[PDB]
Amino acid sequence: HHWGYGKHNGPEHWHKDFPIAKGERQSPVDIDTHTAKYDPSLKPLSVSYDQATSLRILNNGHAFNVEFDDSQDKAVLKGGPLDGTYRLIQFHFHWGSLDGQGSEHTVDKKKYAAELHLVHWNTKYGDFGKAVQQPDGLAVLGIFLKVGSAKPGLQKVVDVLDSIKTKGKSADFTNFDPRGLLPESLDYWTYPGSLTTPPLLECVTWIVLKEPISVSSEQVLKFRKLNFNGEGEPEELMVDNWRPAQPLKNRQIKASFK
C-alpha cells in the first residue's frame, strides 16, 4: 500500500512502486574512510544562515520537517563541491528505536543515533520541484548525532514535538536559527547520490560532515514519542525511519581533509 518503514511497506519493498530504488546512484551509503580520496581541489564549504527564516514544523508521517522561507537568498550553501548557490528549504531527522541505530549514512559501518538532513535546492532551477529533476538540483548537508551532552540549540525543536505528535499536524515555528545545529568543524565527505525516501530521485550532491554533534538521551527520547499514524488511528511510534546503506556501484567518495 503506501510506503513506510514497516515489515510490509519498508525499504525492501520500495522498488515495486519506485524502480529507481535499485538505481546506480542511491543513498545512503557506507563511507569507508580508508577508500575515500582526499581531493585538495575541493573548496571549504560556505554556510550563510544568518538571515534564515523558519516558518513551520510539520509531522508528515515519516519524519518531522522544519520549513524555511526560500523565496529569496536568505539561508544558502555554496562552495565545497558545488557550483552556484543552493537555498535551504527544510531540515529533518532520521532516528532509531535504540541509541545504536538511527543514521542513514554509516562511517566504516558505524551507525549513529540519528542523522540530520539540511535540504537545499539549486537556484538556477527556479523552484524545488524543477531542481529534483536535475542531476545537480539538490545539495543535502548530513550531520550525525551521537548521545552524550545536550545540544542547547536543539531544545526549541524538542519542546514543540508534543504539538505535532501525529501525521498531518503542523505548528508555527518562527525565529529558529539552524546555526545552533552545526558542529565546530566543516570537514566533509562528498559523493553524488539521491533522496533517501520515495521518490528516491538521483538529484543530490551529498555533503556529510565528519564531526558529529552530541544530543542528550532525553532529547532523542522525545523524538521517539512521535507517531507515524494520524490522530485517532492505532498508535505506531515514529522510530527507525532510516533506509539502510545502498551499494556504491561506480562512485567515488571524496574527502575535504586528510
UniProtKB/Swiss-Prot annotation:
S-S pairs: none
UniProt remark on cofactor binding: Zinc. Can also use cobalt(II) with lower efficiency, but not copper(II), nickel(II) and manganese(II).
Effect ascribed to mutating H117 to D/N/Q: Reduced activity
Record: active site: H62
Outcome following mutation: E115Q: Strongly reduced activity and sulfonamide affinity
BP terms from Gene Ontology: angiotensin-activated signaling pathway; carbon dioxide transport; morphogenesis of an epithelium; neuron cellular homeostasis; positive regulation of cellular pH reduction; positive regulation of dipeptide transmembrane transport; positive regulation of synaptic transmission, GABAergic; regulation of chloride transport
PANTHER family noted in UniProt: CARBONIC ANHYDRASE, CARBONIC ANHYDRASE 2
Illness the protein is tied to: Osteopetrosis, autosomal recessive 3: A rare genetic disease characterized by abnormally dense bone, due to defective resorption of immature bone. Osteopetrosis occurs in two forms: a severe autosomal recessive form occurring in utero, infancy, or childhood, and a benign autosomal dominant form occurring in adolescence or adulthood. Recessive osteopetrosis commonly manifests in early infancy with macrocephaly, feeding difficulties, evolving blindness and deafness, bone marrow failure, severe anemia, and hepatosplenomegaly.
Assembly information from the UniProt record: Interacts with SLC4A4. Interaction with SLC4A7 regulates SLC4A7 transporter activity. Interacts with SLC26A6 isoform 4 (via C-terminus cytoplasmic domain).
Record family assignment: Belongs to the alpha-carbonic anhydrase family.
Official protein name in the record: Carbonic anhydrase 2
Organism per entry: Homo sapiens
